Amino acid sequence: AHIEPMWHAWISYQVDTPPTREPLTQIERPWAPKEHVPNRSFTRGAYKPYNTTQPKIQSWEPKAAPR
Amino acid sequence: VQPTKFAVTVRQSRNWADAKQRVIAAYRAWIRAAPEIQTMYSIPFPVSHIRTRIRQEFERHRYVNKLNVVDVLLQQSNADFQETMNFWRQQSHVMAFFKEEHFRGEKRLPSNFITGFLEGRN
Amino acid sequence: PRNAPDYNVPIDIATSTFTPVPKNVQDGSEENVVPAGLISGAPMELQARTVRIYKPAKPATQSGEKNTQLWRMDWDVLGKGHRWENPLMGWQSSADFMQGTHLTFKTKEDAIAFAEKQGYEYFVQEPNERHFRPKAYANNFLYSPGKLKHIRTK
Amino acid sequence: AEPQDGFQGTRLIPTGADFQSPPDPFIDEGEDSVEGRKVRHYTVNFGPQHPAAHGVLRLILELNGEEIVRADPHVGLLHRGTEKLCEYKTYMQALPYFDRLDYVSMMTNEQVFSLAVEKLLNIEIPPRAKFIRTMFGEITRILNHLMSVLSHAMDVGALTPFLWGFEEREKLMEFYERVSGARLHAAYVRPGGVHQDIPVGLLDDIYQWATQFGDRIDETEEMLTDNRIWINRLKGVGVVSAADALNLSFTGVMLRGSGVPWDVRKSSPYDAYDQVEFDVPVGINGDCYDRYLCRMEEFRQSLRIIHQCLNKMPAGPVRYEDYKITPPPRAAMKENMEALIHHFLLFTKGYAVPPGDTYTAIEAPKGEMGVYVVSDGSERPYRVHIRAPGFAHLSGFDHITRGHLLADAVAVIGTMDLVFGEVDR
Amino acid sequence: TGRPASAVMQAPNRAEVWSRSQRPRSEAMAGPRFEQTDFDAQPRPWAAIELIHKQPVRWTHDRIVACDGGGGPHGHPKIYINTDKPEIATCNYCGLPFANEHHRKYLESLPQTSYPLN
Amino acid sequence: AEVELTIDGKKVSIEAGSALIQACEKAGVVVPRYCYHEKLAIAGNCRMCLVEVERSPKPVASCAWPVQAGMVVKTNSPLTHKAREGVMEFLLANHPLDCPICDQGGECDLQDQSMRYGADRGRFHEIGGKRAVEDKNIGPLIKTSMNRCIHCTRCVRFMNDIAGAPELGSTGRGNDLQIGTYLEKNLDSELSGNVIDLCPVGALTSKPYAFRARPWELKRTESIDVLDGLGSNIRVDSRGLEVMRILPRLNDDVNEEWINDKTRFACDGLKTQRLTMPLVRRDGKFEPATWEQALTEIAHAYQTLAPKENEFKVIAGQLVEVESLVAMKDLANRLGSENLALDFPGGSQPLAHGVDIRSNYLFNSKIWGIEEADAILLVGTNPRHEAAVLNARIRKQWLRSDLEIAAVGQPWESTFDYEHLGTDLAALKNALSGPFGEKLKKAKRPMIIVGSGVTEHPDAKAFYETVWSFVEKNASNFLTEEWCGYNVLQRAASRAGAFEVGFVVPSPEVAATKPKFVWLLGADEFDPADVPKDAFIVYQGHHGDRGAEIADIVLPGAAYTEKAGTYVNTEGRVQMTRAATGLPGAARTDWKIIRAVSEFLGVPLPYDDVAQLRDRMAEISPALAAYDVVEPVALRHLSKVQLVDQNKGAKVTGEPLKKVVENFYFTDVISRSSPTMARCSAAKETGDPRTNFMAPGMEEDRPMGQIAYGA
Ligand code: SF4
Ligand code: SF4
Ligand code: FES
Ligand SMILES: [Zn+2]
Secondary structure, eight states: OOSOHHHHHHHTTSOSSOGGGOGGGSSOOTTSOSSOOOOOTTSTTOOOOOOOBOOSOOBOOOOOOOO | OOSSTTOOOOOOOSSHHHHHHHHHHHHHHHHHHHHHHHHHHTOSSOHHHHHHHHHHHHHTTTTOOOHHHHHHHHHHHHHHHHHHHTTTSOHHHHHHHSTTOSTTOSOOSOSSHHHHHHHTOO | OOSOOOTTOOOOTTOOTTOOOOSOOOOSOOSSOOOHHHHSOOOGGGGTSEEEEEOOOOOTTOOOOGGGSSEEEEEOOOSSSSOEEOTTTOOEEOOOTTTTOEEEESSHHHHHHHHHHHTOEEEEEOOOOOOOOOOOGGGGGOOOSSOOSSOOOO | OTTGGGGTTOSOOOOGGGGOOOOOTTTOOOOOOGGGOOOOOEEEEEOSSSOOSSSSOEEEEEEETTEEEEEEEEOOTTOOOHHHHGGGSOHHHHTHHHHTTSTTOHHHHHHHHHHHHHHHHTOOOOHHHHHHHHHHHHHHHHHHHHHHHHHHHHHTTOOHHHHHHHHHHHHHHHHHHHHSSOSSOOOOEETTEESSOOOTTHHHHHHHHHHHHHHHHHHHHHHHTSOHHHHHHHTTSSOOOHHHHHHTTOOTHHHHTTTOOOOHHHHSOOTTGGGSOOOOOOOSSOSHHHHHHHHHHHHHHHHHHHHHHHHHOOOSOSBOSOTTTSOOOHHHHTTOHHHHHHHHHHHHTOOOOOSEEEEEEEEETTEEEEEEEEEOSSSSOSEEEEEOHHHHHHHTHHHHHTTSBGGGHHHHHHHSOOOHHHHHO | OOOSGGGTOSBTTBSSOSSTTBOOHHHHTOSGGGTTOOSTTSOOOOOHHHHHTTSOOEEESSSEEEESOSSGGGSOOOEEEEOOSSSOEEOTTTOOEEEEGGGHHHHHHSSSOSSOOO | OEEEEEETTEEEEEETTOBHHHHHHHTTOOOOOSSOOTTSOOOOOSOTTEEEETTOSSOEETTTOBOOSSOEEESSSHHHHHHHHHHHHHHHHSOOSOTTTOSSTTSOHHHHHHHHHSOSSOOOOOTTOOOOOOOOOOOSSEEEOGGGOOOOOHHHHIIIIITOOTTOEEESOGGGOEEEOSSOOOOOOTTTTHHHHHOSSTTEEETTTTTSOOGGGOEEEEEEOOSSSSOOEEEEEEETTEEEEEEEOOOTTTTTTOOOHHHHHGGGGGGTSBOOSOEEEETTEEEEOOHHHHHHHHHHHHHHHOOOTTOEEEEEOTTOOHHHHHHHHHHHHHTTOOEEEESSTTTTSOOSSOSSSGGGTSBOSOGGGGGGOSEEEEESOOHHHHOHHHHHHHHHHHHTSOOEEEEESSOOOOSSOOEEEESSHHHHHHHHTSHHHHHHHTOSSEEEEEOHHHHTSTTHHHHHHHHHHHHHHTTTTSBOSSOBOEEEOOSSSSHHHHHHTTOSOOSHHHHHSOOSEEEEESOOSOOTTSSOTTSEEEEEESBOSHHHHTOSEEEEOOOGGGSOOEEEOTTOOEEEOOOSSOOOTTOOOHHHHHHHHHHHTTOOOSOOSHHHHHHHHHHHOGGGGSTTOOOOOSOOTTTTIIIIITTSSOOOOOOOOOOSOSOTTOSSHHHHTOHHHHHHHHHHHHOOOOTTTTSSSOBTTBTTOOOOSOO
């Protein structure tokens, strides 16, 4: 998993043009990860899933009316 | 018999007299096998406790007054008997038949209205 | 005892904390009715729960009537155990093994016959039918002897 | 007046026993004495934990010393409820379920379901799709026989041919990955044709592999066909007569080994098999050795068909040209209103299949594979039943093995092409 | 369960949620499962809502403008956008801003726009 | 005079003057359509329904063609095949490629009839491109995507003819003809959200629903609306835990394919202010408790106070089902109490109409009776705000007949022209003795409709005596075999059900007793005088609102989408809801809370299952066992003992009739917690027509957008 993405295609014979000559590697994406992302399993960087949405139901916030 | 150890050819009962003999024959084989069933699956219950379960299973269907339905129940009993006396069932299968060995208990339904209501539909 | 719940019914291995207490379990002695629910292998729970028998209404969003032709048998959702939020992913867990099951019938006597045979409690909802009224294009242009009362726009 | 007529049990229904005719006796050919002593048999469980020939197989055998008395295969260790799941899927969504039945023969498995759905759809697929499916059919037959024959050889001790031939499997799995994007579960053959067209350099790459495959077959035959250990392990083992093979529901090589000339590709031609030339190997002794020789010759006829498909490959579309059944090309879907609607509906609702039912059979690598589909007019099938040749074959294990040596059971388990995804479904 | 900025910021380029049912990262990545974990190693893609609004307005004189994402077959289905209202028109697929030249003076007058205008 | 004709070789008979498309539906022949709707005027503009008619050269619009004595119709000929394919091609030439982003997708008649009746591929590839059209702001409820519009005219015809709101129209000409309000304005109809359903395309979609779900992912539960007194038949679409939208289903007896806006859009209130666990107030602050802990404190506080007769008081709210009222009536009687009150002014007092005869309080001519009404008098009711789908039924009969309407009470802006005779009881007597009494006397099918706010009027005893004395004097007009002319209109779903089981305070003696224990059964509109400050208050309900905040113990109950409950509408039709979702949190079924408290109070109710309670209901009133029918009242004439004889001597104040709905959007607990109803209330006040007014989206003065809905 240490192999850079576009090189991964090259070494697996999915493409013939190496990334050194690959124009799609030249598109500037400021959101693209800057440092390489290896597999992080078996470390403390392992991906932790979570719910990305809010609860479907909201309970009443109790407001005891004064006497 | 011929196909495998406890194989019983599927036949209809000729009349209610015929059916009753099979039902008593089926019960007799079941409660007779209860000692073997205990030691064969290492059941943690006495043969008395196992034999009571046999009678209750036969008592759920005591009120059946339809001959075709009896033939269905008889065929099920033979199939269960064969797969028990042959060591085809595993201890998990036979143990699951005893309703006491579920971690939520055997009284898995509320006793009355108010216990089920206080816990939340049982 | 006149719709009393039988708190002493024998349980089976599929009886859970979400199973309702039944009123009437089949014993194989009912008059004239095949007791399929006794021999089907289905849990006791299905003789404790109520199914709805109805003709699905035409959706208000479309004019096609294809899905109103047949009779539907559906299980009512219980108070507890139909859905809850899984804490890990936020997925929707269920304890109702009948939640995604429905049956289709050509006639309601068929649906009732199947429900009586299995021992389901059932409720029959008859379909609302349209009240016929003739329609005419020329009624858009009727002569008004009096105040117009409404101005039509094609 | 059933079933209330059975409430009090009148008019028992006639059984096969009530129609047993006594044989014609004229022409019918068929004290503490130690001869009355009984012999106790020991019942041995084989599998699935203790190693067996292959797969999830619990084989329960009653033995008399070294001889088999009763053979009782227990299956369902891979029963996954495929037939029920198909009723909650569209026809598109049920197609990948067929890759996973005989899971070394994926494209012919999906071929049989496509042909059955095409029959109820009442559509004729384009000629190029017919030739691609026939071509991949014989590529998949070679993949299966490479797995079947060689792993059967490896079970009786012959390690080396399995290694040689699985490099051939690697080469043909590349063709599966080039067309789809999978080594095994291609989901490539669909009702209407095939998913996408073949890449523009595939035919020549198949051709290059074809020029060297004959030598691979020959070198396999160098180690087995004349080898006296191989012959002594297979000759006279697992014999079934031509008459009993038909009555046991045996199809394919299990039937042709007993001398019956029968191939579904010949008797009921499908795709492009009527446009290709090939011979049908048929045995005469109905034993494991004859069935091995039929399968080795099937290697050569498959290669012979593939070469014809390479030269007869026509131009044109690979998917039936009605966007109400097959998805439109992605460029059409992003370009015109009609195509986008048809794309939306096919991937959410699915196409509706006219009501009715059909039994459709093909000559799968393991024999007659059939599927029985009932359509209710909707987009989900009402009923999908799969006829697996391995199911019928394993049901005959007791008939072919009773009275024979325990040391021949591995030979006939391998002579049946047995994958338990087929058997249990 | 999170002190570092990767555990609080909804995205590297946006602190706040961008939908009402979006769970804030501070609550989502909280609880026992996030105790002994590297938070910079967690997947945190950039917020797409912040990036699309850096795109300048594509000015046009024509009333109707086609948008298919710019990849030809690699984009989205071709749709046609009306620029007659005095506002920035946005493609409902790719979010690209479009405006007619008739509305340039009023759009330049506006204190703040949804898109840079230049 | 049903003529006889041939369609596809099979004979069908239908009334003369019926449209050909109506005969095809009767014959079972499917004919594609876009402009035609059974409830709207025929248009004939889409061209989808063209069929072959013998002796007719041009293919003919089956929606506009009248049926004749002997016509032969071919709907599956090559000519019909060619017409449908060509018309579908023109409909799709300018249609935007938006089905991935369109909310109609999966429930679209353009997609379904393109698949069924059109070609598989399109032939429009013009370099000049498609028509594109600017979007329109028509209020906060309806998101518009006008490129999708196919010009069927259904929304204009509905808004104009049906809803009485002539603000939607079409401007321009040719390919540039555009539906909208020519100037951006809020569409002022409480029936506006019906255009969303009527729209075959996703050009007019629900703003609160936007993008949230696909149609195939929704469980569809047929149920009944409880935010009104009509019991409109509805379809509740839900995705597991969440209800996502309310749709109307057809019931020509009650709601006729329509629902009002609060019925539609208040379903977002079902998930925000919900009671999910018992609360015990302590040291002036609410605190969570178990169900054992809460019922114990009810039992203890009951003993400590030891209430005498009628010191136990129950007030029932607007959304309470009959199971809860019967079980609570059984409980209160076993505590010695007959103090059963309702949530409105004078609900704690005996009612001007009795409950001894069912016809005293019911809408006697049925909702269907409006279809034949000749003359209508409306006393003390704004029908647009109390029964809007019934209000549109009056407009429909008014448009197609010589029906005369008059009203006594507060004037309202009406969708039909009416004669305002006055505002007080004096005006009612003058009217019945005046020219409109003559109209009522000389009319087949007369109707007098009394509002539920008259029942809350101090002169209520004189109103029902005045009205019914007219009914008796002019009987054989008002009181015939085929007709009942006297009608009471209930704006709330629970009132007629409470009347049916006698859930009312019988005598002023019970009304005089000052209660020590008060049970608020989902009551939140109670008068702040029927609840004494020094009484132990128990609130049972599903929503934290006025009632819950002043209570000592809060018990979480169930909303109408979470229970099978029995409801009786204004006409006496007994209907049952179906649960779409389960109970949230630790809530319980409302009748089971009452049954559980009875064991703790030492008076266990006999019934444990809901079937036993439903047997008890038949003993109180056997019509409660007959669902989806209206049992006729046999002794109608006996509605004089309680409406005249007991009401003969009553003090008269002359105070004006009142407006019982100050704001349509805020009527019950569910709509007061609805973020969508808040937007409707805000937009009506400030006149804002923008779609994103308090919702997500870009706005000129809001360039960064906003995530909030309802704020
Ligand atoms: S209206 Fe119908 S056809 Fe048009 S975009 Fe929406 S779903 Fe597709
Ligand atoms: S907006 Fe919808 S309902 Fe109105 S005319 Fe266009 S398609 Fe018909
Ligand atoms: S339905 Fe007849 S023309 Fe539109
Ligand atoms: Zn775009």
